[PDB]
């Protein structure tokens, strides 16, 4: 009895952290599958809501405008009222909060992030499902810490990391990438006091279990095992890394220019902001079936594009149509992520390069899908600049683990030429911009 | 012309780091398949020359002692003369050398770690090819630096790291577990600058090419595809993690105790040291015919044990004899690593747990083979204490990527209870003991 009585005292500090990290991993992961089910609902219903309007084409178009636009204004008003920091992606909002720069207001963000991510993802916009859930998990971790009573010196900065690692592993069914987002991408803020990485592991394996209780599949993207990319054709992946690394910092300077462009066209008036957000949501709501691949989050049409079901002109149309609507849906202050549509843009550009290369090179005997799968995790390394989770996320969700060696080449050639071209990581750039705006506002 | 002329002054020393990183990454990776060819030869040739004159059993056994007794007396004498730092593993020596603690002498270490790892590993010893490959990789990373005379301070700490990751990428054909090795296992030594990790990426992807040109296999371990672990049976992997977590610090205290125990046997003299090591090499060479599952690197019995065709008592005898021949081989000062023997003695304990888990309660439809993959990278997580390196190293060379949640569950359960128990990482413990002996030697 004296042994358990002494380990009750000497291990009271680090074991309560893990016992609460299990509660964080349950809470985000239950809230995350509630979010995923609630966004499958009120989007599949609006998709199948052409059954009562089977002939009236303009009266279908206007009702598809309004039925997404009121949902988009419901998403934007909840961002603008009671918690103005819930907009944008949501990852730099806790990348600052792992440091002592940004403050976490869980009692404000956690309702509005849920009911705004619903309102702007079920509206058929071009946001992602992980941007809400990562910040939602971080606020859930700080909420568990504040519901209990701890000092918060190391306990806060291990529970925000556990919440991020258990949100990103719940939005993607990627447990290993949930750890590697904390280790690789959010490196210079995460402390790693060697009892905090066990809290990251606790949160990851307690959130992915709650995902796999509800959503019964094998992977997220249902693309089969492609052909193994042999040797003497990896220089094509090096050239694909060159192309993604050139395009990468050309991208997200567009999102940083558009973030002040749409700031300039509305000023600071909130009625002139929710109306613009509702107009963007209504445009991408009417765009849901007149061109169903130019709209949407992007998890569909990835098995379509990696199978070669599109022509080259169709693919460049899909690319230049998806880029601009990703800009107008992410830069406008919507509560959704950017980490998911970059996967779809990478898919489209990768299979366009594959359909070029399989025609140009007969002496290689290629398939146009391995370039798509490889180039998926290249725009997540040329713009966000985290290639070790960029390759591992698309390994975890597409099951194509045999082409990990072309994936590392097309991630490395992406990040190398994205650093030689003058370009910062996008999340670090957004965080530095909003921190400079915060510290210059109160001067 | 002028564009290249302005290009050469911005990325002046980064491009030199990446070009010599490609040189290190291509020198290693043929210097590892040279190791693998020279260790497959004079092992298959050795056993073939013994079974050539296979007329009588004890006269076969005495020549099976004398061959690989002579190889062990070659290897131990080669470690003791001209290079006394090449003993044991080498990962502790270059983990110290990534700081300013242990000095690198490539001109001594490179021609003797090669020809000592040949003499010990091909001599049927119980130590693998990631010790004498990661040390060779780091020393090649210093050799290319000294030959090309870069002469910097970031250059040394970058090229030693990219040589270490190239050695671990070419040792196990794992391009992911090379980058994930000097991120977690070498975390408090390696500086994670922007141009260093891309030199690691270059050094790993230029070495996996030079491995996969020569070797044609997809993996190293021939476990085809096991069952998917259902959500009912996930607590059993936590119980396996707890068992490996209490076996964690009993091992590597046994290693550290047997190291000074066999140091007390030889005293301090090269003659008794070599006469001990020759007896150990002759013992593990003679064991290659009586019980051949108690020798070698330990890759022969892993697909035998993961398939259900052993017995419980045979697994107990294999594990016991494997431990008594693993401690006595690594702690005797032989140039060989401890990843692959630990994997080979972890899969036996995992399979022994699986054969009990199937038979106590069949109402899970549990295959007893899926615990072998879970128990391979669960003693690495307990003793070496790089769990994200272990659960990636075991999945790179088996391609059983569907139990990636039980991998994290048992890798958590190993290191959690190995932290509640007073255990250290074995490489940090060996490096601390070596640094204490070095600071005690100078006075």
């Amino acid at each position: 009895r004296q042994l358990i009585r002494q380990l009750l005292e000497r291990d009271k500090t680090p074991l309560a952290i893990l016992f609460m990290a299990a509660v964080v991993g349950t809470l985000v992961g239950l809230a995350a599958v509630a979010f995923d089910k609630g966004v499958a609902w009120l989007q599949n219903q609006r998709m199948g809501a052409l059954v009562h309007t089977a002939d009236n084409y303009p009266l279908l178009l206007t009702v598809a405008f309004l039925c997404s636009a009121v949902l988009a204004m419901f998403g934007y008003f909840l961002v603008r009222k009671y918690a103005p920091e819930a907009g944008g992606s949501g990852i730099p909002e806790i990348e600052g909060a792992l440091e002592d720069q940004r403050p976490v207001r869980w009692w404000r963000v956690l309702p509005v992030k849920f009911f705004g991510g619903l309102g702007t993802l079920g509206g058929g916009m071009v946001l992602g499902r992980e941007g809400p859930t990562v910040q939602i998990g971080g606020n859930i971790g700080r909420m568990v810490l504040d519901i209990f009573r701890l000092k918060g010196d190391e306990a806060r900065h291990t529970l925000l990391a556990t919440g991020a690692a258990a949100g990103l592993a719940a939005a993607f069914n990627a447990p290993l990438a949930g750890i590697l987002f904390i280790i690789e991408e959010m490196r210079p803020q995460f402390r790693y006091t060697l009892i905090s990485i066990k809290a990251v592991f606790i949160g990851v394996i307690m959130s992915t279990i709650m995902y796999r209780i509800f959503n019964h599949e094998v992977a997220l993207i249902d693309v089969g095992k492609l052909s193994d990319a042999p040797l003497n054709t990896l220089w094509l992946y090096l050239i694909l890394g060159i192309i993604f690394g050139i395009f990468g910092p050309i991208f997200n300077k567009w999102v940083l220019g558009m973030q002040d462009l749409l700031h300039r066209v509305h000023g600071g008036n909130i009625t002139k902001w929710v109306l613009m957000g509702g107009a963007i949501g209504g445009l991408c709501g009417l765009l849901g079936f007149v061109a169903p691949a130019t709209s949407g989050g992007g998890f569909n049409l990835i098995p379509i594009a990696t199978a070669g079901n599109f022509s080259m002109g169709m693919l460049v149309f899909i690319f230049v149509a998806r880029v601009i609507t990703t800009l107008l849906c992410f830069s406008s202050g919507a509560p959704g992520g950017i980490f998911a549509p970059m996967l779809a843009l990478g898919t489209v550009l990768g299979t366009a390069f594959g359909m070029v290369a399989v025609e140009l090179f007969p002496q290689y005997h290629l398939e146009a899908g391995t370039f798509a799968i490889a180039g998926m995790g290249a725009l997540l390394a040329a713009s966000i600049r985290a290639p070790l989770t960029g390759i591992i996320l698309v390994l975890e969700m597409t099951d194509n683990y045999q082409l990990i060696l072309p994936m590392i080449i097309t991630g490395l050639g992406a990040t190398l030429l994205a650093q030689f071209t003058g370009g910062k990581p996008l999340y670090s750039a957004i965080l530095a911009r909003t921190l400079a705006k915060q510290e210059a506002e109160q001067l």
Side-chain angles (χ1 to χ4, degrees), chain A residues 1-11 13-443:
Chain A
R1 305 300 300 182
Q2 78 286 336
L3 195 44
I4 66 152
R5 272 306 296 269
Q6 74 79 32
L7 76 91
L8 166 58
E9 319 164 270
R10 278 95 169 97
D11 293 347
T13 38
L15 262 73
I17 296 179
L18 296 164
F19 180 57
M20 290 174 320
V23 182
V24 184
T26 303
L27 261 291
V28 57
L30 208 42
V33 296
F35 186 70
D36 292 315
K37 184 170 182 175
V39 76
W41 187 50
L42 65 86
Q43 175 215 349
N44 75 324
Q45 183 194 58
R46 191 266 316 279
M47 187 63 259
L50 68 93
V51 288
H52 52 275
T53 57
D55 40 17
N56 50 96
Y57 185 75
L59 267 295
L60 161 73
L61 261 184
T62 68
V63 76
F65 184 84
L66 312 173
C67 205
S68 89
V70 62
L71 196 47
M73 308 184 317
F74 171 65
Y76 270 74
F77 200 88
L78 271 292
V79 168
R80 187 49 66 190
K81 202 164 263 286
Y82 319 113
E85 62 266 64
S89 89
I91 298 179
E93 258 297 282
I94 75 168
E95 185 156 321
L98 262 294
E99 302 155 351
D100 300 352
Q101 319 300 287
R102 284 307 288 237
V104 162
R105 329 199 286 191
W106 58 268
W107 65 96
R108 300 181 102 101
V109 180
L110 264 184
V112 299
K113 198 79 203 203
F114 198 86
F115 298 121
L118 283 176
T120 69
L121 280 158
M125 281 170 67
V126 202
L127 310 171
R129 292 196 290 106
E130 71 93 41
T133 59
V134 166
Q135 186 189 3
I136 274 169
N139 300 148
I140 275 174
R142 176 80 150 128
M143 165 194 99
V144 167
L145 185 143
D146 266 22
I147 275 172
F148 295 136
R149 283 189 289 113
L150 267 80
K151 50 215 161 304
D153 50 359
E154 192 71 30
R156 279 180 307 155
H157 310 134
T158 187
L159 280 185
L160 279 172
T162 292
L168 193 142
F172 283 136
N173 207 350
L176 175 85
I179 310 167
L180 287 161
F181 189 70
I182 285 294
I183 302 186
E184 166 90 33
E185 205 280 333
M186 288 168 48
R187 169 205 70 253
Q189 313 93 21
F190 179 53
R191 282 103 165 93
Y192 174 54
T193 181
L194 186 151
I195 329 170
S196 83
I197 207 73
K198 277 169 216 63
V200 161
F201 272 47
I202 283 283
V204 159
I205 72 148
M206 213 52 76
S207 156
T208 321
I209 288 176
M210 302 328 166
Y211 187 82
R212 291 179 184 185
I213 284 175
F214 268 80
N215 299 45
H216 267 277
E217 278 159 333
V218 176
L220 197 145
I221 304 180
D222 51 355
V223 50
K225 179 244 178 192
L226 305 180
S227 68
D228 203 0
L231 267 158
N232 63 70
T233 181
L234 306 188
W235 71 274
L236 289 166
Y237 294 96
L238 184 53
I239 296 307
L240 189 56
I242 297 313
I243 294 314
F244 271 101
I246 282 180
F247 172 68
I250 296 302
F251 202 83
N252 80 19
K253 290 197 309 163
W254 287 349
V255 316
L256 265 297
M258 196 70 71
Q259 270 199 357
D260 66 88
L261 194 147
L262 307 177
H263 208 308
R264 168 66 197 91
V265 305
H266 91 274
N269 190 292
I270 76 181
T271 52
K272 316 213 191 263
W273 192 65
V274 292
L275 192 44
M276 187 259 308
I280 289 299
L283 163 67
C284 289
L286 76 93
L287 204 60
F289 45 83
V290 289
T294 76
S295 193
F299 282 159
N300 61 333
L301 91 96
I302 282 179
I304 306 300
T306 185
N309 279 338
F310 287 151
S311 67
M312 176 70 35
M314 188 77 226
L315 270 179
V316 305
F317 167 69
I318 285 307
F319 194 81
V320 300
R322 277 288 310 273
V323 161
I324 74 158
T325 186
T326 307
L327 299 182
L328 311 172
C329 289
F330 174 58
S331 286
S332 78
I338 204 60
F339 198 79
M342 291 179 166
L343 278 177
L345 268 64
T347 317
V348 166
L349 178 55
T351 184
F353 190 83
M355 281 179 38
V356 164
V358 76
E359 178 255 340
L360 191 43
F361 285 93
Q363 54 157 334
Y364 279 163
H365 294 245
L366 303 176
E367 203 185 299
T370 173
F371 294 102
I373 296 295
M376 277 184 77
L379 197 65
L380 285 194
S383 85
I384 304 190
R385 316 262 295 275
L388 206 48
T389 177
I391 63 175
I392 270 168
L393 186 88
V394 70
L395 287 180
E396 283 315 281
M397 69 175 46
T398 74
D399 215 348
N400 260 319
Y401 289 92
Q402 80 282 341
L403 52 98
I404 186 182
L405 189 52
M407 213 175 277
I408 304 172
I409 300 173
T410 183
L412 158 69
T415 177
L416 182 57
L417 215 47
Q419 188 168 354
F420 173 61
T421 299
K424 308 298 185 181
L426 166 67
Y427 286 148
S428 157
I430 292 181
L431 169 67
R433 158 142 169 160
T434 181
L435 269 181
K437 190 260 183 181
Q438 168 186 310
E439 299 271 41
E441 173 266 359
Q442 45 173 285
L443 184 57

